[PDB]
Ligand binder design. Structure first.
Ligand code: PK1
Lengths: 244, 11
C-alpha cells in the first residue's frame, strides 16, 4: 500500500484556532477565529499538498492555483471527518478549541452552511467511510476544481487527476465496488456547493466589512478578493463526477 | 502576493 503509506505519512496533525472560549460568543469573535484558523490550516494545506505523489509534475503556476481554488473544499471535507470521528457529528469540530454547537452555528450567521456541513459529517458515518478512503478522497479533492479556460499545463494536471482516481478505485477494489465508487463520488461532488456558499458569504462580508467592521487579515483578503471571485463568477468551476 | 510568499516559503 505504497500510496496509502504516503498519504498517512503526510497527513497534517491537529490545528488549534486560538479562540477565547472564556468570553461569550459574538459574530465578530467567531469570524475572527475562523479567519485565523483558515489561515493556519492553509499553511498545512500547502505543506501537505507539496508533498503529494506527483504534485511537482504540475507547472508551478498550476500548483499554486490549484491549492487556492480547492483549499476551502479541503477544509470543509477535513472538518466534516473530524466532526464525525471526534463527536459523532453532534457538533462541528473546526478545531479542538473551536467546536460549534447550534448556538454558535446561529451566532456565526452561517447556520444554513453549518447544517450542510453537519450533514456531510453524518454521511461519513452513514456510508461507513474508512480512514483510508477518507485520505484518498481528500487527496482527489485537491484536483477537483479548475479554470474553465484550462490550466497552464493542462495535460499534466489531467494525468495527475487520473492517477488519484485510479488509487481511490484501488482501495475500493481492495457490484459492491461499483455501488461504492458511485456513493463516494456523490459525496465528493457535494463538497463543492458548500464551499461556494462559504465563499459567497465571506466575499459579501469582506466587501461590506467597512460596515460590519471586521479586520480581514493577510492572506485572507488577498484570496477572497483575487481568487474567490473567479469561482463566484464561473471562470473557475468544480470538476463534477455526476451531472448536478 | 501573500500567498505566493507562503508557497515559496515552504520547502
Ligand atoms: C467563513 N469562513 C470559514 S467557515 N472558514 C473555515 C476555517 C477553517 C475551517 Cl477548518 C473551515 Cl472548514 C472553514 C474560513 O476560513 C472562512 C473565514 C472563509 C474564508 C475565506 C473564504 O473564501 C471562505 C470562508
Amino acid at each position: 500500500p505504497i500510496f496509502l503509506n504516503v498519504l498517512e505519512a503526510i497527513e497534517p496533525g491537529v490545528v488549534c484556532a486560538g479562540h477565547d472560549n472564556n468570553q461569550p460568543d459574538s459574530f465578530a469573535a467567531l469570524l475572527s477565529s475562523l479567519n485565523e484558523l483558515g489561515e493556519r490550516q492553509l499553511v498545512h494545506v500547502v505543506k501537505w499538498a507539496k508533498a503529494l505523489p506527483g504534485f511537482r509534475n504540475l507547472h508551478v503556476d498550476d500548483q499554486m492555483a490549484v491549492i487556492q481554488y480547492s483549499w476551502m473544499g479541503l477544509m470543509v471535507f477535513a472538518m466534516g471527518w473530524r466532526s464525525f470521528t471526534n463527536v459523532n457529528s453532534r457538533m462541528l469540530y473546526f478545531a479542538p478549541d473551536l467546536v460549534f454547537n447550534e448556538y454558535r452555528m446561529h451566532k456565526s450567521r452561517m447556520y444554513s452552511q453549518c447544517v450542510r456541513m453537519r450533514h456531510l459529517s453524518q454521511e461519513f458515518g452513514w456510508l461507513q467511510i474508512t480512514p483510508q478512503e477518507f485520505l484518498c478522497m481528500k487527496a482527489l479533492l485537491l484536483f477537483s476544481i479548475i479554470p474553465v479556460d484550462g490550466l497552464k499545463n493542462q495535460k499534466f494536471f489531467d494525468e495527475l487527476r487520473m492517477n488519484y482516481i485510479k488509487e481511490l478505485d484501488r482501495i475500493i477494489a481492495c457490484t459492491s465496488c461499483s455501488r461504492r465508487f458511485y456513493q463516494l463520488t456523490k459525496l465528493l461532488d457535494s463538497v463543492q456547493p458548500i464551499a461556494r456558499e462559504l465563499h459567497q458569504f465571506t466575499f459579501d462580508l469582506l466587501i461590506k466589512s467597512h460596515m460590519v467592521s471586521v479586520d480581514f487579515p493577510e492572506m485572507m483578503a488577498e484570496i477572497i478578493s483575487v481568487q474567490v471571485p473567479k469561482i463566484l463568477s464561473g471562470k473557475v468551476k468544480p470538476i463534477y463526477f455526476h451531472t448536478q | 502576493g501573500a500567498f505566493q510568499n507562503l508557497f515559496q516559503s515552504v520547502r
